[PDB]
Symmetry: C3
Subunit: 336 residues, 3 copies
């Protein structure tokens, strides 16, 4: 009765991809929730594989290079993440989805790198208000969480500056393997690159005009037309409207409703090809206590959908019956 | 110009169906609002018929039986409610809708029981995040507000334990007479029963895929295909998204928008068959002061829609004209 | 690459159209935001033309007349506004949109009056929870922000009382030139007038049944069928749901989502006929600090859409390239 009967859970508390402290508490926000319990109530066996420890260098060891902040912390963390994800995905080779909770979105360079080592023909569905595809000299901020796809996309490599410590970060994605949903705050140079190299993208304007059901269908058709490929689902929590996920660093008004979010994850889950889902940019240090609780529960419902939770209900494993307990029913009594 | 020119209002402050104190203040939350005034501004004559007094036994008088909490308080309250609703509906036999404000949802066993005495061929539209159809041995909580339909549905009576004090609670509904809208947190055994006995149900997944306009149409077609039957509309306020109804005991993210809620009620009202509407699970003791105000106003707009309020406007009874007052208009002056 | 390369910005801090203090701070709420900066980042040259000073008489100078509150302050302010807007629109005669930030909605009588002097064949798109078309003897409140269209519509002039100081407020609109979107709280006499004189109107019920995409299309077809006419877009911030614009004086539940709001403005902008947009009823003195921030940002995104901001992204003016900076790319290095 289950598409996935087992899953792995992994925390990655990245916080050097952007300057607001708190994304390192993202994984704990989910472990504190009722997520594990709810997943078990649906019959799925979920193993907590712990946390990856990011490499966090001090300032002297990691000065700006090409405007990037903490780029050596990033290159070392990226390789450490990729190694771990690769090994998790190879022991898994019904499939066993890996659920990753961040951490700021700079982690995706590592998770996709490692994922692609185990499954080189994968596709990527990127759910985000933002493109996360700035090349370093175009980044207005220097924040690495705004650049993680640019290092992975083969077509962009003539706009990435060479750095020795980045050598092991091999571009493993073709522009044709990525589709965006949720965009509403692209930088001009992101827009240029996306359109030039033909990356499939469905912005909130597309969601408004097409509806989320057509958008999901067209995104899957664009990068996984016959469901042949493993799916890496990279879900930025700020893809969702600030009304349901306020506790995140770069919140943008006019986002996906929670329900639109669930629909993306439900459809992706139902392909049977969900290989990795990562959830980025939870920051429980942002907003009120009630803000944190809203963001937490949105995250939990999103992750549950990813593992196959069905809003139209699940059947019980064992169907209970009164007579087995030696109890007299109303129907039985009315008979006698 | 009005489908219903008169209506009755009844409070039922049930609070022994679930453990959070405060649902007993639900009716007063609405009497304190501008509801009565707004209904009068549309030309509808609304009579406040007061409150039913629930039977609330002490612990010694009402211990657990088959895991149910406060089950004798429930059986006695159910009969008291049914008697009152029956008598209100028979004096009413244009029709006169009865508007009931709860109170936790355990009251529905009584309201439907009494309603069905006056109108035995009725149908039920159940608007809820939850199924409220757990049979007692499957209930994980023992809370009666999670069980009220199970006692009414004929097909379920071989899974209801016999209790003498429940004898007068006669199953008056066929599975074929009920349709759900809004579901998103069914228990596994609810799912089993609903599907086994073919109860029409439209979950939030159906609402996402079909749209609320098709959902309403299909729900009405399923249980009232030619508008021959009286309608009992049982509206749990937690059917609506927590963003618009936060002050309720079992809030579930991803609910109906207020507008989707209004559309259900507008269509149900416009059939001319709305016989009873009850609004359950208001708890003004939950949430901030602003939470309570949001929940209150959502409830008021919902109830107004039920009585035929039209968002596209109403015509005046008397059309006013300047000349009657002996006043010179701009047009008149420009003439002379 | 731009439909409008220049725009003017004008504040009108009206506050005598309604009794809650604070709408006079509306323009400053927007000047304090990042609006100007964001508009510049899209390549649009925006000139701040300052504020109009409303005429605010004391009580003795301005007693009630025909139940209207502050009607002489209104007539004098209306003429002062109209003169200023006219002169701004004539120097502008690619077109140069005028962006007006209120101020309560009583200002529209003046802005449309002056606009129509420069462009007499204009059409009006009125985005509002309310009709703002009460004639003075039908107004239950006496608040002028609830009456501004009634003075402009030729067909209504036999229901406007003559007042000498109103003589210069010439009715410049035909009922056939106006379309509403967003209505959900019409007064009965508004409903009567709208239907009698055939004013196009699309309420939230129409938005629910038709969807905003069809609604926009039909509104534009009704009053600007071949895009021949200049458009006056009069956007009441309370058209939007209180969840995204809480800081306004007459908030009504069940409004446009922010996204629906953006879609209206995006389509209106894209006609190339957007001549004036005014944004009314911001009140930063209402609600919490976070309420004010939500309302502010909703306003900013709305105004940006009006000037042609594209949620699917903009192309850069200058495309940057690594080699120009004498930097070695990853691709280049891999070659050698
Ligand atoms: N793209 C961003 C955000 C990336 C967020 C990372 B995510 O939360 O993981 O999706 C990034 O940091 O790369 C910024 C960049 C700056 N824009 C506004 C902007 C645009 C153009 C100019 Cl010239 C300037 Cl000065 C500012 C907002 C998004
Ligand atoms: N169905 C509920 C809620 C009924 C709310 C009553 B209403 O607010 O009037 O609609 C009820 O109380 O009957 C609960 C039951 C427990 N589930 C979660 C759950 C599911 C399965 C298991 Cl095994 C466990 Cl331990 C927990 C949530 C809804
Ligand atoms: N139309 C209103 C609001 C206008 C708001 C101006 B806006 O914020 O610029 O759109 C205005 O002030 O003109 C009121 C009038 C009173 N109704 C409720 C009502 C209806 C009928 C009667 Cl008989 C009574 Cl006593 C009350 C709400 C909107
Ligand atoms: Cl597209
Ligand atoms: Cl169905
Ligand atoms: Cl219409
Ligand atoms: Cs826990
Ligand atoms: Cs696109
Ligand atoms: Cs905080
Ligand atoms: Cs009252
Ligand atoms: Cs179903
Ligand atoms: Cs409280
Ligand atoms: Cs500023
Ligand atoms: Cs209409
Ligand atoms: Cs305040
Ligand atoms: Mn983002
Ligand atoms: Mn991101
Ligand atoms: Mn419920
Ligand atoms: Mn319920
Ligand atoms: Mn308004
Ligand atoms: Mn208005």
């Amino acid at each position: 009765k289950l598409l996935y009967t087992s899953a792995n859970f992994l925390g990655i508390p990245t916080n050097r991809g952007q300057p607001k402290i708190g994304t390192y508490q993202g994984p704990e926000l989910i472990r504190k929730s009722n997520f594990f319990q709810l997943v078990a109530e649906d019959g799925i066996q979920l193993t907590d594989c712990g946390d990856i420890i990011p490499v966090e260098l001090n300032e002297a060891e990691d000065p700006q290079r090409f405007g990037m902040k903490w780029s050596r912390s990033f290159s070392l963390t990226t390789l450490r993440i990729a190694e771990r994800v690769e090994e998790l995905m190879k022991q898994s080779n019904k499939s066993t989805p890996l659920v990753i909770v961040g951490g700021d979105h700079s982690m995706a360079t590592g998770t996709i790198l490692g994922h692609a080592e185990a499954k080189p023909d994968l596709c990527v569905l990127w759910i985000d208000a933002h493109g996360d595809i700035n090349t370093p000299l175009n980044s207005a901020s220097g924040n690495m969480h705004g650049m993680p796809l640019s290092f992975l996309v083969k077509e962009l490599q003539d706009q990435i500056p060479w750095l020795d410590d980045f050598e092991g970060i091999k571009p493993c994605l073709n522009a044709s393997n990525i589709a965006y949903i949720g965009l509403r705050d692209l930088d001009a140079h992101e827009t240029h690159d996306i359109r030039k190299h033909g990356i499939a993208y469905f912005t909130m304007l597309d969601v408004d005009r097409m509806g989320i059901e057509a958008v999901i269908k067209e995104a899957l058709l664009a990068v996984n037309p016959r469901l042949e490929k493993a799916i890496h689902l990279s879900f930025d929590i700020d893809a969702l409207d600030p009304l349901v996920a306020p506790s995140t660093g770069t919140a943008v008004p006019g986002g996906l409703t929670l329900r639109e979010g669930l629909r993306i994850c439900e459809e992706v889950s139902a392909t049977g090809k969900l290989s990795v889902v990562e959830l980025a940019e939870l920051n429980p240090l942002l907003g009120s206590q009630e803000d944190v609780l809203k963001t937490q529960s949105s995250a939990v419902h999103i992750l549950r959908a990813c593992l196959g939770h069905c809003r139209s209900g699940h059947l019980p494993f064992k169907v209970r019956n009164l007579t087995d307990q030696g109890i007299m029913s109303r129907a039985a009594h009315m008979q006698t």
